[PDB]
């Protein structure tokens, strides 16, 4: 995140920036070296493993943001000719197969309740009860129970979202 | 001066989308509901 | 499918080698076929002479020759021209004819 | 006498002839009297009864050979010379030769050439094969090509063939194989749309003594500097000939104004007293440069609101601020600090920028991701010169013609090169063997690592 | 399950036609590869256009908008705009469809049709409508896992030598 204290004199700000740069370099290098150790195979402890996991998570997220901004700067790496080539290949294959596009699920679909039940069961399966579930997980369990209770209203919500939601 | 890097990327995205739409217009059996 | 660039000064001999194993006889037959193509009254008599030369076998190659008679002859002459003056002479003689001019344009690009 | 009538000429096939490698007998390894069989493309020892070429002819029925050193054909086993004008292209590809009118008209060629196979290309815009780790050398050599004066000098073997060299001198392999490679690249009637730098890189590794190998990739700037210095030294015959082609083309002169800082941890009285010492006063150590070293500003270390893209950017003129008589760089050697000013004095016709990306911090090598925002078609370096030199200098507007870019991490890096094709004005991106067409406006969006500009 | 898949693959390899005969210079080739960075390098505009072919336009738009959302760790957060998120419930479907397109690129429409059989009577995992069709092409077997491709070619001497020369 951007760090700029308006009232800090610029020489002190420069010194702090140099400090942060040096510490960041050491942080990155030590995280990488420790991960090489752990991966290659060395005896370590839970605290070190967890701290290294945190550091690696932060570094990976930084790299991913770099990737996204580089994409936005360099535009699509796939040229228009390549795009049209693959698109034409796909349409030719689908025409050959004689494929019929999947329609938007009708209002009175025969199996919609079956599909909803399967989805809710799959969502429930992800709870190997440890007796300690956080707020969001317990809330999702409550929502799943509500959908189980009143299938049709949940279907109406789902279709509404699929038709309009984009944010 | 400066460069608005995002603008050239957006232009290229729009060019690709326009060409793909050009191609897609020929394809017929597509489905869409109101 | 045959293209003017495909034909070089020894394309005819290379083709004759697919029926005649001996290099000397292949060269002799190639020269005789080139002479037949050059001094030919018309297509039917030229094809008759070619079959008289190469037997009833090789008829596929004879068909190719008859289908592209002038093209092969002039392309081989141009590619085998030893002297620059000779090369220019054949180039002008070809340019004198549209079809041959088409062949020349295809050869260059 | 039977010459001009060899019946085996049709046997040749130009799809196997590859004259891009060492010319030695494939059985005895000797360099003496090498003949290449034109039916299979292999080299044997030359001619005569019981020789390898003769025995190969009578064994395989391959009856046409070419003297690799004389450019004369022969038909074995009954060895008589062959004379046929349709064979001239093989000899030309084996040993390209450029006439003066050709080198004069080399740049004004707006029509694509076509190789023996159905591949169109343009002379100079030709890919270089990629041995395991070679891309840096490929890019550097491609950039060195496209320099009309140096290219024209090296396209004529007579220019550098007669100069002297001490007995145990291996540093002339570089110059002669570079001439060979330049001629191969600018050959307008190749058999293929790509060339192999194998021989040049073997000479490079040999002369560098395992520095700049081909199984490991080194620094592009280090390779360029070493190559230019080696070429200058090798072309300087049995001495340091003060003016070679490299010096004539690339080398300029700068004026360095070094001022030794008195000391950081001293009282003000002593610090200002030391000014009269003259040791901490500005000097003039005017010297010469093959290439300018531009230093990017340090990355912002924090994103900002404007240019929301996390990628920073600088104008070209901000980093060219250095090399004017005002700015002061801060050199720091042990126990000593210097304030260095710079002032360009002699500008070369082809100017090289070597923007410093990779820097070793306390722990590892980091690549500066800043992008230089520069114009391509016009830049005036008039201001960065002293008024004492501006009068001498008439033309000072430069145009970018070559740009070497590095991509990826410092370890798993790769190199590509944007080259302007003269004659036309089209910009082509060469990666080791791929030739893409890059629009003029997209060159400035890359991490320009090295650049070559032409003075007009 | 994967063990049964391995068993079927082995049986198919063994049951190809004179697959083990190497007297005339034939040679078999097993290729295995991984489609590097498949999930990360998935252009979203192209993905949307591809999806619109098979599924409703609104459904495709919804899926693309879903893939284009904001990621957020404890304190960091960025906007994902290049690759798929892989944590959605339909990421499996998206990945399999993109892999089908990649399969068409690798195989070619003609050979893909030969393998998949006519639309009326599709073939099984490793099977062709006829042994002549089986032998018509160098590629004899193909199988894409989620992102891992296995291919089995059988070249004759002339084909192998021509490929090597190229
Ligand atoms: Zn041989």
PDB file of N, CA, C and O in Angstrom, chain A residues 111-125 144 148, chain E residues 89:
ATOM      1  N   UNK A 111     -35.686 -31.202 -13.687  1.00  0.00           N
ATOM      2  CA  UNK A 111     -34.737 -31.712 -12.709  1.00  0.00           C
ATOM      3  C   UNK A 111     -34.117 -30.624 -11.841  1.00  0.00           C
ATOM      4  O   UNK A 111     -33.226 -30.923 -11.040  1.00  0.00           O
ATOM      5  N   UNK A 112     -34.572 -29.376 -11.972  1.00  0.00           N
ATOM      6  CA  UNK A 112     -33.917 -28.278 -11.267  1.00  0.00           C
ATOM      7  C   UNK A 112     -33.811 -28.560  -9.774  1.00  0.00           C
ATOM      8  O   UNK A 112     -32.796 -28.238  -9.143  1.00  0.00           O
ATOM      9  N   UNK A 113     -34.845 -29.164  -9.186  1.00  0.00           N
ATOM     10  CA  UNK A 113     -34.777 -29.502  -7.769  1.00  0.00           C
ATOM     11  C   UNK A 113     -33.707 -30.552  -7.505  1.00  0.00           C
ATOM     12  O   UNK A 113     -32.994 -30.479  -6.499  1.00  0.00           O
ATOM     13  N   UNK A 114     -33.577 -31.536  -8.396  1.00  0.00           N
ATOM     14  CA  UNK A 114     -32.518 -32.526  -8.243  1.00  0.00           C
ATOM     15  C   UNK A 114     -31.148 -31.859  -8.259  1.00  0.00           C
ATOM     16  O   UNK A 114     -30.295 -32.141  -7.409  1.00  0.00           O
ATOM     17  N   UNK A 115     -30.923 -30.966  -9.225  1.00  0.00           N
ATOM     18  CA  UNK A 115     -29.631 -30.295  -9.316  1.00  0.00           C
ATOM     19  C   UNK A 115     -29.365 -29.455  -8.076  1.00  0.00           C
ATOM     20  O   UNK A 115     -28.241 -29.432  -7.560  1.00  0.00           O
ATOM     21  N   UNK A 116     -30.386 -28.753  -7.582  1.00  0.00           N
ATOM     22  CA  UNK A 116     -30.205 -27.954  -6.377  1.00  0.00           C
ATOM     23  C   UNK A 116     -29.854 -28.835  -5.185  1.00  0.00           C
ATOM     24  O   UNK A 116     -28.987 -28.482  -4.378  1.00  0.00           O
ATOM     25  N   UNK A 117     -30.520 -29.984  -5.054  1.00  0.00           N
ATOM     26  CA  UNK A 117     -30.225 -30.876  -3.939  1.00  0.00           C
ATOM     27  C   UNK A 117     -28.793 -31.380  -4.029  1.00  0.00           C
ATOM     28  O   UNK A 117     -28.075 -31.436  -3.024  1.00  0.00           O
ATOM     29  N   UNK A 118     -28.357 -31.765  -5.229  1.00  0.00           N
ATOM     30  CA  UNK A 118     -26.978 -32.220  -5.386  1.00  0.00           C
ATOM     31  C   UNK A 118     -25.994 -31.118  -5.017  1.00  0.00           C
ATOM     32  O   UNK A 118     -24.997 -31.370  -4.329  1.00  0.00           O
ATOM     33  N   UNK A 119     -26.255 -29.890  -5.465  1.00  0.00           N
ATOM     34  CA  UNK A 119     -25.352 -28.788  -5.159  1.00  0.00           C
ATOM     35  C   UNK A 119     -25.266 -28.552  -3.658  1.00  0.00           C
ATOM     36  O   UNK A 119     -24.176 -28.371  -3.103  1.00  0.00           O
ATOM     37  N   UNK A 120     -26.415 -28.549  -2.981  1.00  0.00           N
ATOM     38  CA  UNK A 120     -26.414 -28.312  -1.543  1.00  0.00           C
ATOM     39  C   UNK A 120     -25.709 -29.439  -0.799  1.00  0.00           C
ATOM     40  O   UNK A 120     -24.980 -29.189   0.167  1.00  0.00           O
ATOM     41  N   UNK A 121     -25.908 -30.686  -1.230  1.00  0.00           N
ATOM     42  CA  UNK A 121     -25.201 -31.793  -0.597  1.00  0.00           C
ATOM     43  C   UNK A 121     -23.697 -31.654  -0.777  1.00  0.00           C
ATOM     44  O   UNK A 121     -22.926 -31.890   0.162  1.00  0.00           O
ATOM     45  N   UNK A 122     -23.257 -31.278  -1.979  1.00  0.00           N
ATOM     46  CA  UNK A 122     -21.827 -31.100  -2.209  1.00  0.00           C
ATOM     47  C   UNK A 122     -21.272 -29.994  -1.323  1.00  0.00           C
ATOM     48  O   UNK A 122     -20.179 -30.128  -0.760  1.00  0.00           O
ATOM     49  N   UNK A 123     -22.011 -28.894  -1.184  1.00  0.00           N
ATOM     50  CA  UNK A 123     -21.558 -27.814  -0.313  1.00  0.00           C
ATOM     51  C   UNK A 123     -21.474 -28.273   1.137  1.00  0.00           C
ATOM     52  O   UNK A 123     -20.527 -27.928   1.849  1.00  0.00           O
ATOM     53  N   UNK A 124     -22.457 -29.051   1.594  1.00  0.00           N
ATOM     54  CA  UNK A 124     -22.430 -29.548   2.965  1.00  0.00           C
ATOM     55  C   UNK A 124     -21.257 -30.492   3.193  1.00  0.00           C
ATOM     56  O   UNK A 124     -20.664 -30.500   4.278  1.00  0.00           O
ATOM     57  N   UNK A 125     -20.910 -31.296   2.186  1.00  0.00           N
ATOM     58  CA  UNK A 125     -19.876 -32.310   2.377  1.00  0.00           C
ATOM     59  C   UNK A 125     -18.561 -31.700   2.842  1.00  0.00           C
ATOM     60  O   UNK A 125     -17.758 -32.383   3.487  1.00  0.00           O
ATOM     61  N   UNK A 144     -27.319 -22.804   3.410  1.00  0.00           N
ATOM     62  CA  UNK A 144     -27.574 -24.102   2.794  1.00  0.00           C
ATOM     63  C   UNK A 144     -28.833 -24.721   3.377  1.00  0.00           C
ATOM     64  O   UNK A 144     -29.659 -25.287   2.652  1.00  0.00           O
ATOM     65  N   UNK A 148     -32.222 -25.721   1.355  1.00  0.00           N
ATOM     66  CA  UNK A 148     -32.840 -27.029   1.536  1.00  0.00           C
ATOM     67  C   UNK A 148     -34.307 -26.883   1.910  1.00  0.00           C
ATOM     68  O   UNK A 148     -35.173 -27.587   1.382  1.00  0.00           O
TER      69      UNK A 148
ATOM     70  N   UNK E  89     -16.923 -22.936  -8.582  1.00  0.00           N
ATOM     71  CA  UNK E  89     -17.541 -24.250  -8.672  1.00  0.00           C
ATOM     72  C   UNK E  89     -17.550 -24.792 -10.096  1.00  0.00           C
ATOM     73  O   UNK E  89     -17.609 -26.013 -10.276  1.00  0.00           O
TER      74      UNK E  89
END
